[PDB]
Design a protein around this ligand. Structure first.
Ligand SMILES: Nc1ncnc2c1ncn2[C@@H]1O[C@H](COP(=O)(O)OP(=O)(O)O)[C@@H](O)[C@H]1O
Ligand SMILES: Nc1ncnc2c1ncn2[C@@H]1O[C@H](COP(=O)(O)OP(=O)(O)O)[C@@H](O)[C@H]1O
Ligand SMILES: Nc1ncnc2c1ncn2[C@@H]1O[C@H](COP(=O)(O)OP(=O)(O)O)[C@@H](O)[C@H]1O
Ligand SMILES: Nc1ncnc2c1ncn2[C@@H]1O[C@H](COP(=O)(O)OP(=O)(O)O)[C@@H](O)[C@H]1O
Lengths: 165, 441, 442, 445, 435
């Protein structure tokens, strides 16, 4: 499936502004902005890393550098419920506790049914046997960007559109 | 050892079956307003009415918010109390009507009791037992899970469900960890290794929780106090799920949203169902909206709408204005900045200014709550300054007087200290006088 | 839930000939207004025509919102009554026309008929097969009665409902097929070798007899706005509670209009029109009125009741004054009900009904004093004095509000006119319009 | 330490004695003896830490030393005390309310002090081995850590093993592991292995191998404001909002919970409360809603001492339609004590100009300083302060090391003050665009 | 060939070593005192010692304030940062105006980084990993026309290579310092393995495999503030599609700015970085709000604030955001205490004629002597900018009739076809229906 709208882009822009070569400084400035002058770098800003590690209770001081240098959707996906130390300022406020208490709690419990309002409205209103009344008129894929005569752009577009993770 | 413009007041000062006397509970004077607030406190403790608005008005430096904090102290910390100013209602993420509705629901509490059968302790053994006839094509067909929990003054082995082994191996429970088992849900939850296993590795991450007290199996009667707004917030956003939208919302900014009437109605009906069941009970509280003349006509109209609701708390308003224009209008002159349709819906309490002796007694009480020693002649001079310029100016000058006394290494404030502090720190009238006489911008 | 301002009103108090009784169902007097509201109620319950604007105009503290609450209480269940204020339209995430469209479509209910099947029996055997990550779940359920025995096939949602409120092969359950709801009715087999994990204090019920699968027909009412929000996006059910439905496109609305018309043609669903009540309707911009003038002419429009207390006041958003704060285009297509002020007798029995609603016992002289102070001042102040005088009477340990409790409540708590006189006699102590105040007493 | 010569960088604290008596010219501050004594009283109020929520108004004419007095108070306060200096227009936000910006500025100025013990084992690993057991449920390891002087072997638990698998260690990179806390960090590869891999990569850096004792003990004191705790507990990963400012209207329930937990930690002994100053420069540029919230938020127990500066006369309060003294309503001025700043004379202007010349490394003659003092008496003080630093550049352009009278005269001719510019505008008003948008572009008719 | 747009004859202030302005130098005609004042300001910027130094240059419209600001920016060179700004640009709908003013403040403070670019490129002739399922080191042998080179590699570069699906024979690009891997394509030696193939084929590079280069990185403090305060997170080097969540501008806190200043000072103390303070030029300052004017007072007293240059063509005008504050140049008096005012004078007939001749020379136009005085008379009669903007229609009307000279008839024709503001307003007043 391809969009009928094609954005034809010259090879000069992609090979002189996005891709790194010998005559530009894409990689050098990218490293200089993301690693060398990052304020979460433990090699140069260890005091701030220790301060934030006391604040959040994260047992790794490199986690603030890893969080700030990853995409938000990727950070959503890779995140696992790691343990945090007790000696920290990031404690648990009360409704987070209740929500995390009412997980696999059964029915005829007060605190489970008090937090299952949407489930009771779903089951009471017979909402899982209702019929869909609206569909969109037109469905379209994203606009295909083509750079004629370049194979790197096809691999990059296929990696962005069909990212395996 | 921290004092800030208050906390010398401890309740109203009302004796039972009677009226308020002069100096009780940190209050001096204001007998009628204290008696009216005591009647309102009894009305809140009666736990029957809904949407009773009280407005108390007067001049500045009269003690309206002192009366509101006395109401909050007299009710106790168990009854909800939401102090608010009219400037909080103007938010940039959500409309002011939703902010007023949220602050209305924040002042209605719920007292929920629960019974929990809890197994807890250090794991002594963990043997997933096989069946007598295992089925082919699998490995370790578990018939039951035997765990051994040890605690203070007792230990007990358990025979658990076979499905708890996947929760144990998913939550990474090992031998010697302290776990937390509740009865009807399964749901293993380790808290950490015991403190008896803390000196076998030089370097390790996890904290070593102590060995838990009491028996391994116990019934604890817990009491949970949550407001209705907590239930609306916990029911608006869903439970912690396994979809990208929920974790995106958890990782992003918690933007406020317009909570629908359907969610509040469903929360109200399930709360009423569990009140009728005899488990939970309702404690209405006070929403104290201070400087109520800063509200405009739309929030006043929605206050008229929401004061007739079924689950509204009492609303306590304060305003120091007189016949003043209501904000949001250009030609509506109303008392206290409050429009007459809202004024019809509330009972007005009057607060009166003080004479010289009451100002002196308030200055003496604020000195004795700040751990300061004032001379009698210095007290008389401070009372004359307070009755000449402002009560708040004389109250705020006590700490510079104490520091100027401490500089000369004495523990008492004298008239030279108050003269030096008067010369150093000006008041509003003298500052306006030097503003008028000086033409140098 | 608690005792509110209109909690004493359950209906309009009208007979079979739509004639108002002088005191019935908590509503006293206002016979022209109550007969007109009964005409509105019968016209809504008839449901033949749509989009009629009704205006309830009168002075403050008269019984306009009381009349609307009586109409809503006489409406009964399963009819959508939307009661909004004037200030709720102004939103930072919705436009005014979109908020008015949502308020309009919250008042049109769709009564959908559903054909379900009820399965109640004793669980014999449960086989649940899941993947290693627990994603794909399937299995078989063996459930029996005293006569029959059937092996069903489970899906993901069925297994999810099974592992919640967990059934242990001998508990009698009830499964609603269309709603997907499991209610564990109790435990029947009472197994001797129970695991010592859960609090096994389940109720003992018998195994049900007869048909395992019984067909049933159920009826539920879903408003048009809920269908719009559900079909708007893939997480519309959560947006029904968070209100995060930002400016639903018109294509969804017209396709859902066509689908609702098709459901009415098929006989699956029927349309239940309701009432949209806009309290304090003068607090709306002229943009809202110009949208309302065309929203009333649609077929899917409820009977709109508006209440306002303003005289010839300035219309919001403009620079001219109009009757009731509404432009003459809206007043042309509106039907106005006029409410009138009360005399001494009606005020007295209104206070008596409010006293018996609050479980407050008044003496006759205290009721006469309350009637006199509700004639001199407004009605709402004397109504609010009742609970204060009740608390004063319970402070002196007698369960009867005497005259002196009302006198003490009058002395302690002020009305509008006394506070106005106290402000105007002491204008130096209060901050005026120019911001000038005299904090000093000397 | 990225500071150039600022507007008031010469001021290092209020020049007071031990009896709170101001010296005539010390610590960069000249004159203003009553204002400096009152600022010393306010500084002692802050340092006592037992009086909270007091509003102080520093009022005076422009170019007098109100913000100079605030800078002196901030410099005399020292480190680890939260000082938040904001302008009056900083709270008119688009993603926050004025009340939310006010309370975020309020909670940035009061903090808690946390002392913790660090048993840091910082070194380069020699080799680490992965003992993949047959069961696989538990992993044990031996960590060969080294410095430039000694090298020890450490037994390693399984949580160490899968915490070193993450942020992976490749036998020669500098790490640092706490003993009691168990924190792990990877500082980077050593300089000994710099020529081992022929190309660095993206997520790597080269650090020196640490020297001396392998196991170090250090007590580090953390000063955390309440706003930091609010932003951290407002989300799941809150430090990104702490450094990007995307907090977004934190709800009051977590603020009440944080206040209760802070009081619990203060009573328990885990931390102590360090109050500070919130300085609102140019406080007249606030709405009346912000003023009422300022009045009613000063009575909280966890409130700092608010210092306010303004230079307005009887001016209109913003958001209203009436004038007021200092641009502030009378209820706000009721709960305040006003420090007034008086105008200068010739000697104090001369001393301030001399101190500003010494702070900029500019050498002036005696008659050049007399001319600059006469200019600062006729015109304002800041005009002569700028004339010093441009006459310095004229002197270096003239191949001279000292600033003479002729350099100051040339700087006076080249750069105009307010009065000369307003006279030259009023003489040729037809050549400028006036308030009605009319202008005469053409020079001839 | 070359494009001239109301400037580009301004090559600089045209001063000597003593800071004295000649009459005609650097494309500047007249305006001696303001040019000497701007030269003093340029020397003050080049001293790199003072912070927050604010000047405002004021005068009538079309008198050369922006010309003086561009001459300052030309005299400082391209190394020193210069942020040109209009006063209307501070009003943003995404973030508040004070944050935009602070962003433009920190855009005018730059850094100089000496960095080394090292590039390995060529055809891959050997790709052998070495494990211990974890790769330990990677042996890669590149090949160019001048020879081969065999390199060890850490497993991160193999992670990038496996991202790039690099096989044997693919001409690739490797940066040594940053680890950036780019696959150019396959070589021509493997261009005949199939008759038709999806792969692209690049020739063998004629240069050496190992290339070293010294380059200069010119960044600003605002660039580091933006790169350290991405609200959603970082992004890869190659990303043709944006993130699914829209990243908007946020109010960057003072803590991030303090940490960035600390890191920059630490890099400066090692000699890696050099601090170059620059110029923030806000043009048409008179439409700044009183909020922005008030925040400018606080921002000018910062320790890292740049040299701020303001321009205004107003007289006795009300400050925007107020109702009765009448102040000179539209700038409030508490701010005007903090600047030095440089007066910009109008021109006479001879200066206008010389400016017209200079602009005609810089636009490659030959103007007759008789037409030049008529253009000067039209400049003195209507406006200088009207006479400057009429040179291009004069040139095209001359080229239409096959000529390379501006005759007086062509100037009369261009005056007849195109009208100034005065004759347009004269038509506007003496007309009935909307012009
Ligand atoms: N009757 C009283 N007895 C003791 N202290 C009082 C009394 N009335 C007022 N105060 C003190 O005066 C201070 C200011 O009063 P406040 O509540 O601000 O009055 P208002 O709200 O009318 O301005 C309070 O801190 C309170 O402690
Ligand atoms: N006829 C009535 N029956 C019952 N209660 C009434 C009646 N008339 C007035 N009331 C009481 O007086 C008040 C009427 O004011 P409201 O409901 O705001 O309507 P309106 O704004 O038209 O006066 C209500 O609180 C209601 O309890
Ligand atoms: N007492 C003083 N001692 C030293 N410098 C001063 C003093 N008063 C003012 N200054 C200097 O004068 C300059 C302008 O004064 P400033 O404090 O900005 O006035 P204002 O407080 O009215 O804004 C500042 O750079 C400040 O350093
Ligand atoms: N001394 C000068 N020499 C040459 N050209 C000049 C001179 N002064 C002004 N100009 C020209 O006149 C025009 C004035 O426009 P500009 O400087 O942008 O506006 P303003 O003068 O109102 O600030 C510029 O295009 C500039 O090229």
């Amino acid at each position: 499936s391809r969009n009928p709208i094609k954005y034809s882009l010259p090879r000069l822009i992609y090979e002189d502004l996005i891709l790194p070569n010998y005559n530009n400084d894409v990689d050098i400035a990218n490293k200089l902005k993301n690693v060398k002058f990052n304020i979460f770098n433990p090699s140069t800003n260890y005091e701030l890393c220790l301060f934030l590690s006391k604040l959040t209770g994260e047992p790794s001081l490199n986690e603030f550098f890893r969080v700030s240098t990853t995409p938000l959707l990727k950070r959503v996906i890779e995140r696992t419920n790691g343990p945090k130390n007790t000696d920290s300022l990031s404690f648990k406020t009360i409704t987070q506790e209740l929500l995390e208490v009412t997980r696999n709690a059964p029915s005829e419990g007060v605190m489970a049914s008090l937090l299952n309002v949407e489930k009771h409205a779903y089951e009471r209103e017979y909402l899982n046997c209702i019929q869909r009344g609206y569909h969109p008129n037109v469905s379209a894929p994203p606009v295909t960007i083509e750079v004629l005569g370049s194979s790197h752009v096809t691999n990059s577009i296929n990696n962005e559109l069909f990212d395996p993770l | 050892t921290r004092t800030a413009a208050h906390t010398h007041i401890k309740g109203l000062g009302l004796d039972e079956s009677g009226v308020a006397k002069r100096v009780e509970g940190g209050f001096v004077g204001q007998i009628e307003a204290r008696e009216a607030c005591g009647v309102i406190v009894d009305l809140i403790k009666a736990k029957k009415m809904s949407g009773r608005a009280i407005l108390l008005a007067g001049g500045p430096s009269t003690g309206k918010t002192a009366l509101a904090l006395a109401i909050s102290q007299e009710l106790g910390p168990k009854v909800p109390f939401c102090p608010l100013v009219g400037s909080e209602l103007y938010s940039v993420e959500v409309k002011k009507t939703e902010t007023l509705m949220e602050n209305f629901r924040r002042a209605i509490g719920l007292r929920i009791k629960e019974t929990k059968e809890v197994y807890e302790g250090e794991v002594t053994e963990l043997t997933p037992e096989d069946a007598e006839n295992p089925l082919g094509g699998y490995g370790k067909t578990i018939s039951h899970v035997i765990v051994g929990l040890k605690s203070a003054k007792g230990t007990k082995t358990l025979r658990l469900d076979p499905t708890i082994y996947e929760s144990i191996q998913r939550e990474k429970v090992s031998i010697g960890d302290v776990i937390y088992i509740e009865a009807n849900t399964g749901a293993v939850k380790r808290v950490g290794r015991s403190d008896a296993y803390a000196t076998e590795f030089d370097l390790e991450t996890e904290e070593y929780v102590p060995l838990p007290k009491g028996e391994v199996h116990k019934k604890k009667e817990i009491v949970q106090d949550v407001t209705l707004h907590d239930l609306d917030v916990a029911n608006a956003r869903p439970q912690g799920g396994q979809d990208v939208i929920s974790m995106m919302g958890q990782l992003l900014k918690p933007k406020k949203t317009e909570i629908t009437e359907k969610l509040r109605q469903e929360v109200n009906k399930v709360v009423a169902k569990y009140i009728d069941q005899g488990v939970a009970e309702l404690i209405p509280g006070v929403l104290f909206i201070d400087e109520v003349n800063m509200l405009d006509i739309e929030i006043f109209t929605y206050l008229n709408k929401a004061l007739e609701s079924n689950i509204a708390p009492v609303v306590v308003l304060a305003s120091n204005r007189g016949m003043t224009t209501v904000r949001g209008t250009e030609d509506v002159i109303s008392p206290h900045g409050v429009p007459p349709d809202l004024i019809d819906r509330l009972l007005i309490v009057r607060t009166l200014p003080y004479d010289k002796d009451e100002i002196r007694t308030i200055i003496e009480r604020r000195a004795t709550v700040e751990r300061l020693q004032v001379e009698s002649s210095a007290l008389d001079l401070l009372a004359t300054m307070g009755t000449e310029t402002s009560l708040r100016y004389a109250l705020q000058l006590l700490a510079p007087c104490g520091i100027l006394a401490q500089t000369s290494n004495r523990k008492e404030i004298v008239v030279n200290d108050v003269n030096e502090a008067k010369l150093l720190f000006l008041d509003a009238k003298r500052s306006t006088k030097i503003l008028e006489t000086s033409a140098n911008y | 839930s608690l005792i509110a301002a209109h909690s004493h009103i359950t209906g309009l108090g009208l007979d079979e000939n739509l004639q108002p009784r002088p005191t019935s169902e908590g509503m006293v007097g206002q016979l022209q207004a109550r007969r007109a509201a009964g005409v509105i109620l019968k016209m809504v319950q008839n449901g033949t025509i749509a989009g009629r604007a009704v205006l309830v105009a009168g002075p403050p503290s008269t019984g306009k919102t009381a009349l609307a609450m009586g109409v809503s209480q006489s409406l009964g269940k399963d009819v959508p009554f939307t009661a909004i204020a004037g200030s709720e339209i102004f939103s930072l995430e919705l436009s005014k026309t979109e908020a008015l469209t949502q308020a309009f479509r919250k008042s049109i209910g769709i009564k959908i008929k559903e054909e379900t099947e009820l399965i109640e029996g004793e669980v014999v055997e449960i086989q649940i097969d899941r993947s290693i990550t627990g994603g794909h779940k399937q299995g078989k359920l063996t459930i029996k009665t005293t006569d029959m025995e059937t092996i069903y096939e489970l899906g993901n949602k069925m297994i999810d409902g099974l592992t919640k409120e967990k059934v242990l092969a001998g508990d009698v359950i009830s499964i609603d097929k269309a709603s997907g709801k499991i209610t564990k009715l109790g435990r029947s087999f009472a197994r001797s070798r129970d695991y010592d994990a859960m609090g096994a204090d389940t109720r003992f019920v018998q195994c049900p007899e007869g048909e395992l699968q019984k067909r049933k027909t159920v009826v539920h009412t879903v408003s048009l706005h809920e269908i719009d929000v559900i079909n708007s996006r893939t997480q519309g059910f959560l947006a029904l509670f968070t209100g995060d439905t930002g400016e639903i496109r018109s294509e969804v609305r017209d396709q859902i209009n066509t689908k609702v018309a098709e459901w009415k043609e098929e006989g699956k669903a029927e349309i239940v029109p309701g009432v949209l009540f806009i309290d304090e309707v003068h607090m709306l911009d002229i943009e809202c009125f110009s949208f309302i003038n065309r929203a009333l002419e649609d077929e899917f429009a409820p009977i709109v009741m508006m209440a306002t207390n303003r005289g010839v006041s300035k219309t919001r958003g403009t620079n001219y004054k109009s009757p009731h704060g509404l432009p003459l285009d809206l007043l042309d297509r509106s039907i106005i009900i006029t409410t009138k002020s009360y005399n001494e007798q009606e005020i007295k029995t209104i206070l008596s009904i409010r006293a018996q609603e609050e479980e407050v016992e008044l003496s006759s002289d205290a009721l006469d004093l309350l009637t006199k102070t509700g004639v001199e001042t407004s009605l709402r102040y004397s109504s609010n004095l009742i609970s204060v005088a009740q608390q004063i009477a319970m402070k002196r340990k007698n369960n009867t509000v005497e005259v002196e409790d009302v006198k003490r409540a009058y002395l302690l708590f002020l009305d509008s006119a006394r506070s106005v006189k106290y402000v105007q006699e002491n204008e130096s102590q209060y901050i005026d319009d120019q911001g000038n105040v005299q904090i000093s007493i000397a």
